[PDB]
Each structure stands twice: as structure tokens, then as C-alpha cells.
Amino acid sequence: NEYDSDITTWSPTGRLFQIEYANEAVNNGSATVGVKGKNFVVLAALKRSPVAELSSYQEKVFEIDEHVGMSISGLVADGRVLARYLRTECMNYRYMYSNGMPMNQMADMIGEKHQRHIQCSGKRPFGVGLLLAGYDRQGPHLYQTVPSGDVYDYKATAMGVRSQASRTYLERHFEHFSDCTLDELVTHALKALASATSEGIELNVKNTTIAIVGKDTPFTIFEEESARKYLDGFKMRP
Amino acid sequence: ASGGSVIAIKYKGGVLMAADTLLSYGSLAKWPNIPRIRLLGSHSAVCATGSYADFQMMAKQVEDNIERQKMYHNVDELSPSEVFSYLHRSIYQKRCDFDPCLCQMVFIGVRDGETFLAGVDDVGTRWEDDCIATGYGAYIALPLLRQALEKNPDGLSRGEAMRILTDCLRVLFYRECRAINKFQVADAASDGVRISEPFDVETHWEYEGYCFEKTAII
Numbered sequence: 001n002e003y004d005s006d007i008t009t010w011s012p013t014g015r016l017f018q019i020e021y022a023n024e025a026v027n028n029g030s031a032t033v034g035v036k037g038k039n040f041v042v043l044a045a046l047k048r049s050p051v052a053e054l055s056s057y058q059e060k061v062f063e064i065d066e067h068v069g070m071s072i073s074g075l076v077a078d079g080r081v082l083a084r085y086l087r088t089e090c091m092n093y094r095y096m097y098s099n100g101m102p103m104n105q106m107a108d109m110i111g112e113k114h115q116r117h118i119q120c121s122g123k124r125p126f127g128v129g130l131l132l133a134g135y136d137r138q139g140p141h142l143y144q145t146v147p148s149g150d151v152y153d154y155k156a157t158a159m160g161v162r163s164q165a166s167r168t169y170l171e172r173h174f175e176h177f178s179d180c181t182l183d184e185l186v187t188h189a190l191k192a193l194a195s196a197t198s199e200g201i202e203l204n205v206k207n208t209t210i211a212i213v214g215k216d217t218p219f220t221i222f223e224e225e226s227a228r229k230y231l232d233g234f235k236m237r238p
Numbered sequence: 239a240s241g242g243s244v245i246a247i248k249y250k251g252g253v254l255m256a257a258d259t260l261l262s263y264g265s266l267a268k269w270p271n272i273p274r275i276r277l278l279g280s281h282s283a284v285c286a287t288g289s290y291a292d293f294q295m296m297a298k299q300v301e302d303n304i305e306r307q308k309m310y311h312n313v314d315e316l317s318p319s320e321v322f323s324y325l326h327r328s329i330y331q332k333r334c335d336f337d338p339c340l341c342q343m344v345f346i347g348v349r350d351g352e353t354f355l356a357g358v359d360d361v362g363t364r365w366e367d368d369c370i371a372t373g374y375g376a377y378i379a380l381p382l383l384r385q386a387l388e389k390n391p392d393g394l395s396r397g398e399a400m401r402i403l404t405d406c407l408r409v410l411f412y413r414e415c416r417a418i419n420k421f422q423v424a425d426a427a428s429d430g431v432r433i434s435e436p437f438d439v440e441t442h443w444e445y446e447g448y449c450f451e452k453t454a455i456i
Contacts, residue, residue, distance in 0.1 A: 096327050097320040102313045137314050 022147035025127030029073035031160030031196040034131045035189040036142040038178045040214035041133040043071045044189040049207045061211045065090040067100045069219040071131040073160045078128040103134040103141035107151045114149035166196045186230045194236050205231045239290040243373030244344045250393035252427035253346040253355050257285045262416045275424045279304045282318045282347030283424050283431040287372040292339045318347025318354040330362035342372040348426045374414050379406040408439045
């Protein structure tokens, strides 16, 4: 196989192998699950567990503005490159029009920023996938970006290592999300997330982040302190 | 070329912006039949005092931005306050380059109840009231509008505000040199901005104190 040496080489079957490799970087990151309701969006990310006494803590969830937010998966050293740009652009927009940038415009910005990096020789595709969570005049939006540059407006999604089981759970309850309320949304999201962890590991405040953004609710991250309202009572009931 | 004065007032439910339809070249009344009220998007309208080239360029630059934004992406069109904010930021940015946009603008707009009326200078100053006026209308017209507002703060009616708009346009015609008696009134209600056909306000020049014998300095 000599047709993956560069990002600017087409295989005889019209494939870009560097991008098909970059997708494997997302398929091996920490699992995250996003669930979009009628008035709220809930992201639930599974961080790294403490080794019996010691707590390694890495920022996967980011706030981009009062109404936006994003959970990355894959190489974080690219997620920060994109979060700096998204923050800069939502600020350049709130400075001109003095209002929050609409999601349908920010998703396209992310798409173009990705695509600009998959067409030249001295570049490489971002090996990081995003879960955008926003709210504007038109209501809650949940996107998902891939390394190839696509953007998908989702109703409920999950990505990361062994996220196929999270999707297999979500593809049974995703028809009733427009009616379940906030607590029910965060419970659906946590139940879907805990379905991607290892065998003998369960969800608890130590290894879970819960971000929420809705109509009257700015983007709030939830770590150990107040995650207990949604996390301390939680059982993976089969 | 340069426009005249603009006045504008909020009534119960909408905005009214009146402006004379004339462009002057210094002291010469050059073009008396041109429209000075532009309207941007489907909710807002603008009218500028002073140089016409600068207003013509700025209004074009902020009308390209609205339609593109709405056509490219599936988003709602910009509210009045946001397109005015963009107007203000662009005027200030042109001023920092010593490339001023030498025209005081009055900006009106209505979107589903939240009625908006603002004004922006050319140095970057912006403000918002229940009555705006640029050019000489800030001295002659504005006091009358302010009194007609405060004599009943509950909110004027549409006819009761059109009356005072005519009464101030009359004085602006009397006491402003570079002005003519053919105005236009853009009325912005919930449906959207609507520019009226040119009309003329009646005058009075038959005081007895103007008789030839009396005004005589023999």
C-alpha cells in the first residue's frame, strides 16, 4: 500500500487514505454522548478514571460562548486549536452584531476550517471530532464534526471508543426526546454513556462531565461538585 | 452632493421617519426628485444626512451583508438592532482609518413588537430615543417632537403623530435654507417598512406683519 503516503493522493478507488486514518483517531478517543431535547441540549462525556488514589483530569468539554459549547474526542492537541478559533469567531461575531452567532452559521464555519486542511501538501487533517451544543432563536442544535470536514445536524449521537453500544441504546429512545424534560434528558444521556464503558466500571462523579445548554440556561459544565444531582442516584438497570 | 435633514418618531405600534427628497451641491438645489429613504432587509430602514456618496456606499455594504447571510446559511434575517450594530461598528472602523463616513444616519425598524429607533453620527457616536433628528432637524424639529412626546407619555397615535410630523416638517421648510417642500414618510409597523408617496405640507405666508409698508426700512 503506497497510496497513503500523502493527504494529496487518490487511490485507484477514489479514496483518501490519510482521512480514513484520521477517522481512526476519533474512533479511539474517550466516549461522549449528546442528546438534544425540545428546549435543552445535554452533553455527557466520560473522562479518565482515578487510579485508586490519584486523579488525572483533562479538559474535554469547552464553552465557546454563552449559548454554545463543544465536547471533543480524539487528539486534544487539535481540539484546542479548534476551540481557540471558534471562540475567536464567536467573539468577532458578537462584537459586530451584538448577538450570539447562530448554530447553522457556526457549523459551516467549522466545516470550512476543516476542509481547508485536507487539500494542500504541507497540512494534515484534524484528528479530532466535535460535539457542538447550542441554542439560538430557532432552538437547540446538536452537531457532530468529523476529520473529513463533514457536519451532521443530529437529534442524538455518540462517538468515541465502543460508542456503537451507546448508539444502539440511543436508537430506541430517540423518538421521545422532544417530550422528556431536563432530568429525563440527562438520565437518558447518562444511561447511553454508561453503556460504552468497560465491563466492571460504572458511572460516578469521578469520571463524568455533564454540560447543559438551553433556552433560559447559559452553557453550564457540571463536574464532581454538582454532578451528584444527576449522578449520585444512577443505576444501569438492564 | 448632500442630503438634508431627517426626523423620526415612535408612536404606539411603529416608527415614522420623514425626509425631504432633495440633493444639494453646496448652495445649489441639484436634484429634487431622488429617494433618500433606503430600506434594508425586510424589517428596517435608514436615512442619512450629509454627503451622499458615503451613505450610498455604506448602505450598499450593509445591504449586501444582510442578504448574503440569509441566503448562504439557513438562518433568520438580522433583527433591526443587530444590523444597526453592524452599521455602527463599520462607521467607527472607517473613522479610525481617517476615512470617515461623513453622514449622520437615522435607523428605524420593527420586528414582531420590539420597535427600534436609533441614530448614529459619523465619528462613531450612537444613541437611541423615542425621537431622532439629524442635520438642522436636531435644533428646529427635535424640540417640537420632544414636547409632543412629553405632553402625553402614554404613547402617541399614528394620526396624532403624523400630525406633529407635518407640523415639524413645515417649520423645517420655513427655517432651513437648503430644503424644499416635497417630503417622504417611511412608516414601519409590524408587517414591515412602507415608504409613502411624496407629499407636500401646506404653508402660510399671509401674516399682516409681512406687508410691504411695515417691513420697510426707509
